[PDB]
Amino acid sequence: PVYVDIDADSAFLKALQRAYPMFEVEPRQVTPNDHANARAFSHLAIKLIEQEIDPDSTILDIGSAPARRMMSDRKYHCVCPMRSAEDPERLANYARKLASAAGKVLDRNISGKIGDLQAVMAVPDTETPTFCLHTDVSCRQRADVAIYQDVYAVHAPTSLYHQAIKGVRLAYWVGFDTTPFMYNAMAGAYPSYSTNWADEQVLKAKNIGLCSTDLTEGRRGKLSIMRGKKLEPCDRVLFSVGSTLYPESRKLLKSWHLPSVFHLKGKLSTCRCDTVVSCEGYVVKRITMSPGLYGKTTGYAVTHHADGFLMCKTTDTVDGERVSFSVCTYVPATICDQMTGILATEVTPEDAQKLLVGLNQNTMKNYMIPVVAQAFSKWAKECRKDMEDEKLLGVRERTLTCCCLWAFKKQKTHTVYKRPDTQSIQKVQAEF
Amino acid sequence: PVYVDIDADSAFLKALQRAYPMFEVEPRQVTPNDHANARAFSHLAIKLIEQEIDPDSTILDIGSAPARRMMSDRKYHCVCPMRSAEDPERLANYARKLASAAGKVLDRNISGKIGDLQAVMAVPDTETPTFCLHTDVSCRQRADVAIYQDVYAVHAPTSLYHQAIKGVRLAYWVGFDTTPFMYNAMAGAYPSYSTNWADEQVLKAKNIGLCSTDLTEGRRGKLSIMRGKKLEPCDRVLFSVGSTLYPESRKLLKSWHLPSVFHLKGKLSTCRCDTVVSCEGYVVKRITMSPGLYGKTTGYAVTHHADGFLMCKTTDTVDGERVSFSVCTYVPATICDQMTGILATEVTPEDAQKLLVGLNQNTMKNYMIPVVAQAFSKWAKECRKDMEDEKLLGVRERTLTCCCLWAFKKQKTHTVYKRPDTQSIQKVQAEF
Amino acid sequence: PVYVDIDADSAFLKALQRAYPMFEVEPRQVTPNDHANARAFSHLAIKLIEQEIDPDSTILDIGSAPARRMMSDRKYHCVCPMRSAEDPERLANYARKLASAAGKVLDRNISGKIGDLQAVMAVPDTETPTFCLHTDVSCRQRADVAIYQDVYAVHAPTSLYHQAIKGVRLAYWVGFDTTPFMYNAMAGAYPSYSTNWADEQVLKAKNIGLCSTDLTEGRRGKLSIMRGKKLEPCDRVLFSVGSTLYPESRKLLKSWHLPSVFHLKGKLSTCRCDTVVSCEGYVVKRITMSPGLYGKTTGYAVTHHADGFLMCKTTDTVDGERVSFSVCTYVPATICDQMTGILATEVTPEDAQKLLVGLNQNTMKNYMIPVVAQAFSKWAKECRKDMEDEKLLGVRERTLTCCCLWAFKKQKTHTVYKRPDTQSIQKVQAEF
Ligand SMILES: C[S@@+](CC[C@H](N)C(=O)[O-])C[C@H]1O[C@@H](n2cnc3c(N)ncnc32)[C@H](O)[C@@H]1O
Ligand SMILES: C[S@@+](CC[C@H](N)C(=O)[O-])C[C@H]1O[C@@H](n2cnc3c(N)ncnc32)[C@H](O)[C@@H]1O
Ligand SMILES: C[S@@+](CC[C@H](N)C(=O)[O-])C[C@H]1O[C@@H](n2cnc3c(N)ncnc32)[C@H](O)[C@@H]1O
Ligand SMILES: [Zn+2]
Ligand SMILES: [Zn+2]
Ligand SMILES: [Zn+2]
């Protein structure tokens, strides 16, 4: 009987129950959290991890908040490298809770957790069995299972290797789906979790999920020192999960988009990465490690789309300058199935938006209805073009460019639309 | 009373109950598996195999996961050649299970399986009665029945001969239907199992089940070193069963499309291959083995279509380059029977898609709906052409090409549509 | 109380009950057999044969599987020539079953059947009372009744004479209706049994029951060594009953289309052939023997059509080459009676197909609806021409071709449509 701090009549509830069929999910709202869905998913993911693994095993959780691991009889190595700015306050709250139940609870090893804390504030390199202050690439504990809950700011292969050489055979990564970042989107949204994200180059946009601009009359533009001439995604992006900000990096996010099979080649030598939980943009990936190189890797990563996924071209204004960039999002499967019949023809963005609103009135958040409509209007258009320019079966028409090279014409692809029950396949680096 | 890890209200349930009338299939969902239908079908296939064969017989299963064979009183030779990269993790889980029930269960010969495991990790050539680490062409155990559960990456005649010389009289192959690869399709889908497969040449496509492309403006194409000038399916294909990747080969897949009667001719010398279970793209084939050469072989293989099967030409964009290739899929029999009345005429693909959507709103997955529409729109067109160009009865009009040869005009065949209650007959190699 | 391994709600059930009024047919599905109707008909045919004949008589069954004849107190001479490739496997299964009830059942003479088996695998010419390994024209057993269940690959007069000189007075042939093959059809279908059959020259066709072709762009045809110039049925045909292949010969199949009265003239010298069971393409014919020559023969064979029978010209593509050939099938009597009103006029194949589908939506299989429509569209057309070109009563207009010969004009006959309650009369050879 798992309890979730969400509304008793929230639409996400059902989806959550579909994501965790082995648990009886019951709502109990005690906080008007702006991102309660994320916390509920994280709670059920942790409960699933505890259920699925060995009860007698030390559990190290990378970059974790020690306050959340309370009331858990399982041994936890709450790794707190003290790197981020939020960590001192998390430790303060954890110490407050640890000092508030000295003679209240005894089965949760709190009596030894007090000693562990007193030890770690004596010598900075104090590797207590249950708590330490080091990064994941420097901790010396030798446990069996690793946990990365909402940990995106770290290189996945390096950390996985560092725990693999540390005896960790199982790793769990609970976090946002990394498929949008393998598509190189300038901005995107997880509407089911009230989450938005955007590259720093479009944080001053107008009509995206995470942006803020100013009223202007259409004056002369900035005498920019840099010409620009190109708007391409940069490494630094901003995540707004409710009203909370996280600065993330595209390289580190893509590092966690591990293929199904990959190799770890360092001092010690195959590994697997499978998506065991996937709900409306939040995923739980079960990585498992095994010493010795066995088999061979294709370097291919697969994402299965229960709901529709879109990455489309859209025109906005950044600081008042009209530009076009890519925006990604998720659309519920019911909406995608109801849109199949209409999308057989060329539909204008306005009619598509009106039909989408009619199907909504809310299954999907209205704030991203327009762009999706445009996406569909592009998709149904492009497919129609593929109807008109029917090529011969198995013939490529390439022109010899007066040299030893061959060139072809690339069509206009404005929308990438992964329908429900489809899969995105992306070539990724293996054999780290 | 067989229990299936599927939803309690899933549409596939009924089809599953229609595939195993001997059993009482009851749903019990404990995992949100992206490919639960595949595992349910495999489970019932194993149960059917166990019911239909001799209880007193050592049962060797080729390339099997030893964890699934637990709680089975029948003797199992779990052959684990340690070739793929997922196998060490399977052995780790199997050893965990074998060490977690030492004093718990005693009727499953686990006490002896522990000794077998400790034997196999002592000498690499330890052929224990219940476990060994060798390929199917090198193991020396002499049992009576062979099982190939989801084993596609092996040569069927070679493995069948190697087990026939080992005394194996019965072989079972549970896996995806191999008819699409005898048709040489570039890509295909088993929608009832959320499965999408594609040739490596078209993994960067736009609107197929297994693909992922990027947004482009229509720039100059790649200055390719190879001219191309032909798009034909290659040996390497990728399977996505839910969110799991499998690199398969066309030759080994076609090797398992055995004819009804074929001969094994080596050191020792008829064989039969029949499809005993067939459900919406997943088949269980019962190969029966017999020493000596008896009768004669036609070299013909037969596939019966309970549901409609389609392999049609479709135009997509691979890496932004517009090409045309073949895509195959299955369509429910109810849909095919409802489409029969209108397909007497020429119907545009848009009208076909709208009629398909009206008949769907879901019997079939919507992401396959458009292309099937195209297929039907092509098929109904081509049939109409055969109506217009009525030839004479038993006359072939071939022109003498000013030589001792004869030539004829080939018509445009863009769609192969095997309706329900039809059969595909393909000439394959016999007498290996 | 006969039990049939068919669905409890199958539409064939009623027809089966109409074909065996003396039995109580009850469904009991224990296998998802692709050709369960054929096996149910064979079971009831065998049981009807057993009921209708002398309980105290040795019953030799030609080319039979010995596993089927189990649980039958009647003495059986299961003749197994070992000619086909399926015989080692059926005998292996039979030995398994005989060895699995050595202390279970004792009223089925199994204790003596074990001795008979041990005898036949000692000397190859061991003619045991109940089992032997010889062809029907070499076995020396002298019994009273012969049974040919699904035995098409043998010459009817030769085998019938060979068992007539062996004292067999009664013979039963349970198999497929041979009327389509006396009409010399290139392809055909028994839809009620999911059965198709095609000549080897049209196995690469496009839109028939048993065919499989490939997508082509309409390129240059094969530089054939043979000119062709004629497409006529050949001796070798392929039968697909569900998903099982049988290579049959037209000569041996037509051999069993025996007339009502025929003579056997050899060393010993009338015989009768009557169709005692007929159901939707499956026939049980009762042949009765009498020594000596009595009466005289007309050489005429009669087939009574309870349901409509069609053989019509249709245009398809064999290996992409557009040709026209004959296709035969059966149509339910209700459909034919509903077809009578509108066939008084000329009806386009499209309208005929639409009205046929309206009458169907399934009484008849949809996959053969179009061609039948074409057939009807031709038939109602040709009849109309006979109405327009009204000749005189008893006058034959024939031109003297400047010689002692006379010639007439032959009309275009594209469809033969034997309506229900009609008979096909064919002149066949007698006095073998
Ligand atoms: C989201 S915050 C902590 C919340 C945590 N994900 C949870 O749900 O319990 C991410 C944390 O990762 C830690 N971190 C930063 N860099 C790290 C690294 N290189 N290795 C391990 N942890 C790190 C930071 O201290 C930061 O507090
Ligand atoms: C799908 S995985 C195992 C799962 C298995 N099909 C099951 O359901 O239990 C296929 C396995 O076949 C094994 N294999 C690969 N090549 C083989 C070969 N040549 N002979 C026998 N097994 C092989 C690999 O070790 C791989 O783990
Ligand atoms: C349809 S299969 C047997 C199944 C059998 N009719 C039944 O329903 O039980 C055809 C069989 O005819 C047998 N056969 C082939 N040639 C024969 C011959 N010349 N005389 C008698 N039987 C023959 C073969 O052994 C083969 O098994
Ligand atoms: Zn530590
Ligand atoms: Zn072995
Ligand atoms: Zn005999």
Author numbering:
A (entry chain G), B (entry chain E), C (entry chain C): 3 to 271, 273 to 364, 377 to 447
Quote the study that presented this structure, word for word.
NsP1 possesses both N′7 methyltransferase and guanylyltransferase activity and reverses the order of these reactions. Each nsP1 protomer is built around a methyltransferase fold common to SAM-dependent methyltransferases with additional insertions (membrane binding and oligomerisation (MBO) loops 1 and 2) and extensions (ring aperture membrane binding oligomerisation (RAMBO) domain) that contribute to pore formation, oligomerization, and membrane binding.
Common to other N7-SAM dependent methyltransferases (N7 MTases), the SAM ligand binds in a pocket near the switch point of the Rossmann fold in the capping domain. The density for the SAM ligand is not fully defined in the binding pocket, where in maps reconstructed with symmetry, only density for the base and ribose moieties is clearly visible. Contacts made to the SAM ligand are primarily weak van der Waal’s (VdW) interactions, involving residues I64-A67 from the DIG motif and P83, R85, T137 and D138 to the base; S86, D89, and R92 from the DPER motif to the ribose and residues R70, G151, and D152 to the methionine. The SAM base forms a hydrogen bond (H-bond) between N6 and the side chain of residue T137 in nsP1, which maintains a second H-bond with R85. The purine base is bound in the anti-conformation to the ribose, where the 2′ and 3′ hydroxyl groups of the ribose form H-bonds to the side chains of D89 of helix αB. Although the density for the methionine is quite poorly resolved, its position replaces the side chain of R70 in the apo form of nsP1, which is also poorly defined in the structure. Taken all together, these data suggest that in the absence of GTP, SAM is not stably bound, and does not satisfy some of the contacts required for correct positioning of the substrate for methyl transfer. The correlation between the presence of SAM in the active site and the disordering of helixes αC and αB suggests that binding of the SAM alone also induces significant destabilization of part of the nsP1 capping domain.
